[PDB]
Amino acid sequence: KAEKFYSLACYHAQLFSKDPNTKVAALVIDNNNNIASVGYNGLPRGFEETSDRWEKPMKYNYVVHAQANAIATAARNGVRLDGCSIITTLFPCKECSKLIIQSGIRKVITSKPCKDSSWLESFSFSNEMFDECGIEVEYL
Amino acid sequence: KAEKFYSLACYHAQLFSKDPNTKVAALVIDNNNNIASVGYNGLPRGFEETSDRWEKPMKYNYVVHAQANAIATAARNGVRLDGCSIITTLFPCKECSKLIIQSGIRKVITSKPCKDSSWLESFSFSNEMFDECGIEVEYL
Amino acid sequence: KAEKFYSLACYHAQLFSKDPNTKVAALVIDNNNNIASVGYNGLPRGFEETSDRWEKPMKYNYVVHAQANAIATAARNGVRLDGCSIITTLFPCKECSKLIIQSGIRKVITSKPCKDSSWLESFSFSNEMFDECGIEVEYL
Amino acid sequence: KAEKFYSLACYHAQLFSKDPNTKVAALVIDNNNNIASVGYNGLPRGFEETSDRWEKPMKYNYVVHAQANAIATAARNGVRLDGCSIITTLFPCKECSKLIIQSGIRKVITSKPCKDSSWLESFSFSNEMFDECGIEVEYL
Amino acid sequence: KAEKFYSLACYHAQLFSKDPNTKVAALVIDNNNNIASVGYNGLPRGFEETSDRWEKPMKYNYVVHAQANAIATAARNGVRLDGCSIITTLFPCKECSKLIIQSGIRKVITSKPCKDSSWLESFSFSNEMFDECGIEVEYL
Amino acid sequence: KAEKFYSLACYHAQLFSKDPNTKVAALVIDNNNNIASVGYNGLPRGFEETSDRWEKPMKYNYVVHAQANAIATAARNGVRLDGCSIITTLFPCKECSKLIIQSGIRKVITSKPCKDSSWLESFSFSNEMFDECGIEVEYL
Numbered sequence: 148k149a150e151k152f153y154s155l156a157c158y159h160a161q162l163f164s165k166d167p168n169t170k171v172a173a174l175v176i177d178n179n180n181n182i183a184s185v186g187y188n189g190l191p192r193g194f195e196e197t198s199d200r201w202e203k204p205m206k207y208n209y210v211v212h213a214q215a216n217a218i219a220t221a222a223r224n225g226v227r228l229d230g231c232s233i234i235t236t237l238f239p240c241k242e243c244s245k246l247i248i249q250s251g252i253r254k255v256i257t258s259k260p261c262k263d264s265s266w267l268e269s270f271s272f273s274n275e276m277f278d279e280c281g282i283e284v285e286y287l
Numbered sequence: 288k289a290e291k292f293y294s295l296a297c298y299h300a301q302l303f304s305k306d307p308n309t310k311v312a313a314l315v316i317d318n319n320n321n322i323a324s325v326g327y328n329g330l331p332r333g334f335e336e337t338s339d340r341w342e343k344p345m346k347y348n349y350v351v352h353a354q355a356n357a358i359a360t361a362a363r364n365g366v367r368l369d370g371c372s373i374i375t376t377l378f379p380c381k382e383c384s385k386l387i388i389q390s391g392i393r394k395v396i397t398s399k400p401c402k403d404s405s406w407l408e409s410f411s412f413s414n415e416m417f418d419e420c421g422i423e424v425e426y427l
Numbered sequence: 428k429a430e431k432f433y434s435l436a437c438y439h440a441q442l443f444s445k446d447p448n449t450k451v452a453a454l455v456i457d458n459n460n461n462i463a464s465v466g467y468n469g470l471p472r473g474f475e476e477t478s479d480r481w482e483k484p485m486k487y488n489y490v491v492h493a494q495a496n497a498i499a500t501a502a503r504n505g506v507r508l509d510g511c512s513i514i515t516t517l518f519p520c521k522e523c524s525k526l527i528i529q530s531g532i533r534k535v536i537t538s539k540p541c542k543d544s545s546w547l548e549s550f551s552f553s554n555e556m557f558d559e560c561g562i563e564v565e566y567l
Numbered sequence: 568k569a570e571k572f573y574s575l576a577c578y579h580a581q582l583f584s585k586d587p588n589t590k591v592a593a594l595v596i597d598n599n600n601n602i603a604s605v606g607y608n609g610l611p612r613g614f615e616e617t618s619d620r621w622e623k624p625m626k627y628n629y630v631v632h633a634q635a636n637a638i639a640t641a642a643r644n645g646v647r648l649d650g651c652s653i654i655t656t657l658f659p660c661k662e663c664s665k666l667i668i669q670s671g672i673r674k675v676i677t678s679k680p681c682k683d684s685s686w687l688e689s690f691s692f693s694n695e696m697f698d699e700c701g702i703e704v705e706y707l
Numbered sequence: 708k709a710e711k712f713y714s715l716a717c718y719h720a721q722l723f724s725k726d727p728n729t730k731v732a733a734l735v736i737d738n739n740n741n742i743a744s745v746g747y748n749g750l751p752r753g754f755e756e757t758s759d760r761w762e763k764p765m766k767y768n769y770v771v772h773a774q775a776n777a778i779a780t781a782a783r784n785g786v787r788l789d790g791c792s793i794i795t796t797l798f799p800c801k802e803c804s805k806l807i808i809q810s811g812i813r814k815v816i817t818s819k820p821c822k823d824s825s826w827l828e829s830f831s832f833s834n835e836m837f838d839e840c841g842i843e844v845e846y847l
Numbered sequence: 848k849a850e851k852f853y854s855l856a857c858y859h860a861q862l863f864s865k866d867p868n869t870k871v872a873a874l875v876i877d878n879n880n881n882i883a884s885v886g887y888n889g890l891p892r893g894f895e896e897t898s899d900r901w902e903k904p905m906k907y908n909y910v911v912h913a914q915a916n917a918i919a920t921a922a923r924n925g926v927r928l929d930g931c932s933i934i935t936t937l938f939p940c941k942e943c944s945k946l947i948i949q950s951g952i953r954k955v956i957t958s959k960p961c962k963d964s965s966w967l968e969s970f971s972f973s974n975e976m977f978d979e980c981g982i983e984v985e986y987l
């Protein structure tokens with residue numbers, strides 16, 4: 148089931164993300180394997196999406212990460228995430244990892260980062276926080 | 288009312304936040320002036336808070352912002368924030384601004400940043416996003 | 428957007444549904460295009476899925492429909508659906524249509540049934556109920 | 568308490584159901600004996616109720632069952648049913664039994680079917696699914 | 708509909724309430740006539756119900772009112788009551804009226820008090836608060 | 848943490864309560880130390896606040912207690928209080944104690960009453976109900 152959800156998230160990212168380089172999506176799943184929340188990476192809702200704003204490095208000032216969006220959407224709609232797992236097509240950065248911990252999510256399921264990534268340092272802080280705070284990491 | 292909530296938020300930060308430089312709190316409030324969520328800045332729950340982890344600039348890798356915490360708590364407990372206002376003792380950084388927009392919060396109430404702040408560039412992106420996305424900014 | 432959700436729903440069905448003839452999925456989506464609930468067709472959770480139980484016509488006694496599942500999951504988790512739209516890879520049968528009406532879903536988005544379908548009579552009652560009760564039907 | 572809730576449901580059916588032959592109601596009860604959801608059998612809300620549409624067999628194309636309505640109402644309003652019991656004046660048919668299982672309801676409390684019933688075959692499938700999926704049945 | 712709910716409430720009180728003098732129940736109902744919460748008058752859950760504790764006037768120190776119970780249950784289970792109506796077999800006392808106003812209930816439906824009632828003074832304050840705060844009172 | 852929440856509640860009462868003699872506030876806290884609900888004592892929302900209505904003894908006919916307001920607000924907004932603790936600047940009266948028990952709150956954290964209080968008899972009934980119904984009382 149986890150691998151199928153990962154495949155489902157890869158497709159969601161390809162369908163919806165306007166990021167020209169890296170399309171990211173995340174699914175928050177409860178203990179009955181039901182979907183509690185979904186997000187993809189994009190500029191905030193209604194924010195004009197121009198070519199200049201989607202180029203690197205400018206885009207980092209504007210882009211909302213997929214995992215942050217799944218959690219913000221649950222806050223917006225009042226969907227309780229405590230105790231769920233998060234399945235994400237990309238390992239969460241340090242800022243998303245903070246949100247995952249504080250939102251009560253207990254497990255991150257994803258793929259091992261391409262260690263040519265420019266996010267490797269951010270991911271190192273993610274792993275330090277996850278392991279000490281007791282959030283499991285599972286790689287498919 | 289907004290001013291009394293800001294004062295309450297200031298006291299919340301002084302009571303709870305362990306940041307040695309800048310203690311921040313935020314309150315999310317609905318149209319009846321009822322409190323829907325509260326947060327303060329701090330390291331993730333259960334992350335050992337050593338002096339080295341709270342020193343600047345290392346603390347930025349670990350500290351969870353007050354507004355991010357209030358939103359993440361609402362996702363954790365399934366408390367709907369759509370349509371609420373957020374009263375914060377510090378203007379939200381660009382990342383918190385993305386969360387505010389995506390969680391359906393309509394209005395930010397805070398103090399005008401001290402123009403000696405090191406966060407002015409981040410706040411500059413916050414206001415560009417708030418203005419295009421139609422989030423009202425109210426200064427006390 | 429509706430078309431991308433329909434495509435995502437199609438992939439969800441192909442990944443998860445064990446029906447050997449017709450795999451169906453549905454997405455319930457609010458006015459911000461956020462996903463509130465998801466379902467696919469399958470036997471009840473934990474019911475052993477033997478070849479005999481999945482053969483037609485015996486499977487109709489056991490199979491839970493995708494739209495029924497998405498609504499039942501929302502009841503299970505307390506996720507409010509009032510005012511949402513439902514995007515489904517198959518037009519809802521008359522029983523699913525009753526659930527859609529009673530759960531406050533306002534709009535059905537799907538494909539026009541293949542006029543070789545064995546469900547045309549059931550769909551005929553669905554549309555009579557949708558029209559009198561004011562549920563919009565939108566075909567992709 | 569269970570028998571009093573059953574009596575309460577019998578009265579609710581008599582008060583509200585327009586079915587000319589069989590009036591049905593159901594109460595979803597949590598582990599503190601609080602009422603989480605209530606339904607009765609009827610045509611969908613706002614659907615014209617004519618004599619022709621309430622006659623047998625035509626009515627089966629239109630009538631929403633009491634247990635299906637209690638669950639659809641919880642989906643509509645975002646009331647969490649997971650782990651509750653359902654007390655119903657009539658044994659749930661196979662379609663309602665699927666919804667009961669998927670909505671997380673753990674126990675069905677009702678009266679033994681009159682085994683002159685035309686629903687006996689549908690009830691046989693209900694019992695097969697309940698017993699294998701671990702939903703208890705209690706007869707008063 | 709309001710009259711049928713009042714009748715159902717009367718029966719609920721007769722079935723469940725242990726008050727030897729006056730059995731009271733209340734139903735909180737949304738704009739679709741769905742039941743959001745139900746209560747009846749009784750001592751707190753688990754408080755031993757001796758004859759001395761149910762005798763007047765000692766019972767007033769312990770008895771929980773039906774309308775207070777329906778609201779407290781909604782707080783317990785997180786069921787939103789904002790905008791609902793309350794149908795009660797007895798006019799709410801001044802304390803219940805404060806709860807009704809603060810929980811966002813918009814309308815009280817009940818019977819006109821028997822002018823031999825010992826609660827007329829309390830009801831007098833109830834109506835002054837309902838009128839200034841804009842809660843509609845409807846008598847059956 | 849409990850003592851800091853008590854200090855936070857004392858300030859909230861001083862900021863917001865218009866009671867000329869005794870300002871009261873209460874915080875409902877979950878097992879992760881997150882704030883679920885907040886209240887202070889005051890006349891009902893929108894009720895004209897005149898000097899005559901805030902004088903003793905007239906005010907008791909109108910004033911909503913802080914703990915009752917925290918619970919009514921949770922009912923209004925659909926915030927689930929079951930299993931939380933309540934931290935209050937004043938010991939709950941017998942009527943608030945009934946609401947605390949019925950709303951699923953499991954622990955009262957407060958300060959020992961000034962035993963020159965005119966509420967001592969009401970508090971005696973509170974303690975009888977709390978101890979028999981299994982709600983803990985903790986004094987700071």
Ligand SMILES: Nc1ccn([C@H]2C[C@H](O)[C@@H](COP(=O)(O)OP(=O)(O)OP(=O)(O)O)O2)c(=O)n1
Nearest residue numbers: 186187188189190191192193211216460461462
């Ligand atoms: N189901 C959804 C819908 C939206 N979003 C997030 C992704 C972006 O951060 C933001 C906005 O998404 P879009 O840009 O796709 O949608 P807009 O509303 O901005 O419209 P448009 O596509 O015209 O830009 O919301 C999400 O995570 N999940």
Ligand SMILES: Nc1ccn([C@H]2C[C@H](O)[C@@H](COP(=O)(O)OP(=O)(O)OP(=O)(O)O)O2)c(=O)n1
Nearest residue numbers: 326327328329330331332333351356880881882
């Ligand atoms: N009501 C609360 C409780 C917690 N938090 C946030 C602040 C921090 O980002 C994180 C953890 O807070 P603390 O460090 O104060 O609490 P811990 O659980 O880590 O315990 P300790 O005080 O021993 O560090 O949760 C919050 O915003 N609001």
Ligand SMILES: Nc1ccn([C@H]2C[C@H](O)[C@@H](COP(=O)(O)OP(=O)(O)OP(=O)(O)O)O2)c(=O)n1
Nearest residue numbers: 180181182466467468469470471472473491496
């Ligand atoms: N995210 C989910 C998970 C489940 N279901 C529904 C589909 C079926 O009606 C039922 C059970 O699904 P599965 O058969 O896939 O899962 P089980 O729990 O039965 O396990 P298994 O795959 O071993 O049969 O729940 C759903 O609609 N959406």
Ligand SMILES: Nc1ccn([C@H]2C[C@H](O)[C@@H](COP(=O)(O)OP(=O)(O)OP(=O)(O)O)O2)c(=O)n1
Nearest residue numbers: 606607608609610611612613631636740741742
């Ligand atoms: N508290 C309620 C209210 C309604 N329903 C269900 C029963 C029917 O399936 C549908 C419609 O009920 P009614 O026919 O009684 O109400 P309408 O809104 O259709 O009005 P009318 O009575 O004029 O037909 O809603 C329910 O289960 N519980």
Ligand SMILES: Nc1ccn([C@H]2C[C@H](O)[C@@H](COP(=O)(O)OP(=O)(O)OP(=O)(O)O)O2)c(=O)n1
Nearest residue numbers: 600601602746747748749750751752753771776
């Ligand atoms: N569906 C319910 C269940 C309970 N209550 C309220 C009524 C009383 O104020 C309290 C306790 O009800 P009971 O006394 O009937 O139930 P107990 O749990 O105390 O058990 P017992 O019947 O053995 O006294 O809860 C309610 O309003 N609605």
Ligand SMILES: Nc1ccn([C@H]2C[C@H](O)[C@@H](COP(=O)(O)OP(=O)(O)OP(=O)(O)O)O2)c(=O)n1
Nearest residue numbers: 320321322886887888889890891892893911916
């Ligand atoms: N965050 C809040 C807001 C309000 N209340 C309660 C306290 C009173 O019982 C009632 C009304 O509060 P106020 O009198 O402060 O507010 P009003 O809306 O009545 O306005 P005003 O201050 O002009 O009287 O609501 C509360 O407990 N918590």
Ligand SMILES: Nc1ccn([C@H]2C[C@H](O)[C@@H](COP(=O)(O)O)O2)c(=O)n1
Nearest residue numbers: 166168169171188212213238239240
């Ligand atoms: N935890 C993360 C990290 C990154 N991203 C998003 C931000 C960018 O849109 C993209 C990475 O862009 P790039 O590969 O160009 O750095 O992935 C995300 O959604 N979640």
Ligand SMILES: Nc1ccn([C@H]2C[C@H](O)[C@@H](COP(=O)(O)O)O2)c(=O)n1
Nearest residue numbers: 306308309311328352353378379380
């Ligand atoms: N929108 C923001 C921006 C910053 N902070 C927090 C992070 C740090 O803990 C502190 C600022 O630290 P300093 O003053 O050392 O930059 O405020 C916050 O909670 N919300």
Ligand SMILES: Nc1ccn([C@H]2C[C@H](O)[C@@H](COP(=O)(O)O)O2)c(=O)n1
Nearest residue numbers: 446448449451468492493518519520
């Ligand atoms: N509204 C509907 C109608 C049908 N189905 C499911 C039931 C079966 O699993 C499949 C159709 O099977 P067949 O094509 O063999 O009739 O679609 C569904 O999920 N929703």
Ligand SMILES: Nc1ccn([C@H]2C[C@H](O)[C@@H](COP(=O)(O)O)O2)c(=O)n1
Nearest residue numbers: 586588589591608632633658659660
């Ligand atoms: N599980 C079930 C089965 C049936 N019914 C309803 C449908 C009809 O309105 C009535 C039975 O009608 P009859 O006895 O004429 O078949 O009961 C129901 O609400 N729930």
Ligand SMILES: Nc1ccn([C@H]2C[C@H](O)[C@@H](COP(=O)(O)O)O2)c(=O)n1
Nearest residue numbers: 726728729731748772773798799800
């Ligand atoms: N608004 C009110 C007022 C009273 N009661 C209850 C309290 C007692 O149990 C009963 C009245 O008792 P008596 O008739 O002896 O005064 O009604 C109630 O539930 N709601």
Ligand SMILES: Nc1ccn([C@H]2C[C@H](O)[C@@H](COP(=O)(O)O)O2)c(=O)n1
Nearest residue numbers: 866868869871888912913938939940
């Ligand atoms: N459990 C209680 C008891 C009392 N109060 C409020 C009611 C009055 O506003 C004040 C006490 O007023 P006094 O001290 O004049 O009796 O405290 C409260 O909020 N909660």
Ligand SMILES: [Mg+2]
Nearest residue numbers: 192193194196
């Ligand atoms: Mg966009």
Ligand SMILES: [Mg+2]
Nearest residue numbers: 332333334336
């Ligand atoms: Mg800590």
Ligand SMILES: [Mg+2]
Nearest residue numbers: 472473474476
């Ligand atoms: Mg299965």
Ligand SMILES: [Mg+2]
Nearest residue numbers: 612613614616
């Ligand atoms: Mg009708």
